[PDB]
């Protein structure tokens, strides 16, 4: 795998006017999928990470915004990164986005990590853009190759035994972390149950306990569910993504949960900032914002 060449071509478009494509060969992309999949399967499904670390939320194929976030935080290996999922769909350049993220996972496998979002599953990204982008620029078989790779992404991470990270949220069925660790990969994301909830659930300030979810999938959870979960597992913070928030980050339940969304001006339809959370080695957490002007 000519990995350095691939990263060079992906980064070559930094000085370009947004929208310039990077058309790697199909075989290079398959190589990124195959080698990253092997690494995902060799590492835990519940990651145990240590700070310093940069944590990013949704990207949704906004590749030129991803390039600016790395400029902001330092390109690997200058900084360590945990991404909370939703690399593809909705944006103009999902293929460049996932290829750069997969290439950096292969290049720096102990310092660069990707979680699974709800858009990293066949049923969702068949519809919301990634399949169409694969088919237009390559072929359907390549989308199936990505699906196999996505089916092996890890599901959650714990930073410094204190920050629980996943894409969506909590689950009424999540009593022990061991329940996450026993999940075998590759796996699809079912339309209900523990793995679905980790990728799909939402906090809600108006709900007591567990409520129905307006997406028609999973649940909402209230502030006391978060507090009880943090206390039982000796955790300090839940870090999740999954929802567009005006400032790029948004606290819930007296800063016991934070939502991160890293795609500014999302889809060209929202006026939102994108944010990353930087965790230094003393567990001081700070927010870096990319705001529309």
């Amino acid at each position: 795998l000519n990995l350095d060449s691939i990263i060079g071509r992906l980064l070559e478009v930094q000085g370009s006017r947004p929208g310039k494509n990077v058309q790697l060969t199909e075989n290079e992309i398959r190589g990124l999928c195959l080698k990253s999949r092997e690494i995902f399967l060799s590492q835990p499904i519940l990651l145990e990470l240590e700070a310093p670390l940069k944590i990013c939320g949704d990207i949704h194929g906004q590749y030129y915004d991803l390039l600016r976030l790395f400029e902001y935080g330092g390109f690997p290996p200058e900084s360590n990164y945990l991404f909370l999922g939703d690399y593809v769909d909705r944006g103009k350049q999902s293929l460049e986005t996932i290829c750069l993220l997969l290439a950096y996972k292969i290049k720096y496998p102990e310092n660069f990590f990707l979680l699974r979002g709800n858009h990293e599953c066949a049923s969702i990204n068949r519809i919301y853009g990634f399949y169409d982008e694969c088919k237009r620029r390559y072929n359907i078989k390549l989308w199936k190759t990505f699906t196999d790779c996505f089916n092996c992404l890890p599901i959650a991470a714990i930073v410094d035994e204190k920050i629980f990270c996943c894409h969506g949220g909590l689950s009424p069925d999540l009593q022990s972390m061991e329940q996450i660790r026993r999940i075998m990969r590759p796996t699809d994301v079912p339309d209900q149950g523990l793995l679905c909830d980790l990728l799909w659930s939402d906090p809600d300030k108006d709900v007591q306990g567990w409520g129905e979810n307006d997406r028609g999938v999973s649940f909402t959870f209230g502030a006391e569910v978060v507090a009880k979960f943090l206390h039982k597992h000796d955790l300090d913070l839940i870090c999740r993504a999954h929802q567009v928030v005006e400032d790029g980050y948004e606290f819930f339940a007296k800063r016991q949960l934070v939502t991160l969304f890293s795609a500014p001006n999302y889809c060209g339809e929202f006026d939102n900032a994108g944010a990353m959370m930087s965790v230094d080695e003393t567990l001081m957490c700070s927010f870096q914002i990319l705001k529309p002007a």
Partner: protein
């Protein structure tokens, strides 16, 4: 190990703010061109795809209610 029962996290009073690039992020919305018959076909395509070629461990859901 780094765990403990004491609260260790802190949040900084400073927030770093920088400007996003000014570009057109509007993208094509192919799913808006799908009819009902289109969606029905795709559901069957996905069904066949998962039933016959997507490798997994036949994972699925638990329930008790």
């Amino acid at each position: 190990p780094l765990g403990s029962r004491k609260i260790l996290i802190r949040f900084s009073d400073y927030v770093e703010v920088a400007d996003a690039q000014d570009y057109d992020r509007r993208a094509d919305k192919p799913w808006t061109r799908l009819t009902a018959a289109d969606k029905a076909a795709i559901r069957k395509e996905l069904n066949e795809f998962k039933s016959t070629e997507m490798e997994v461990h036949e994972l699925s859901r638990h329930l008790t209610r």
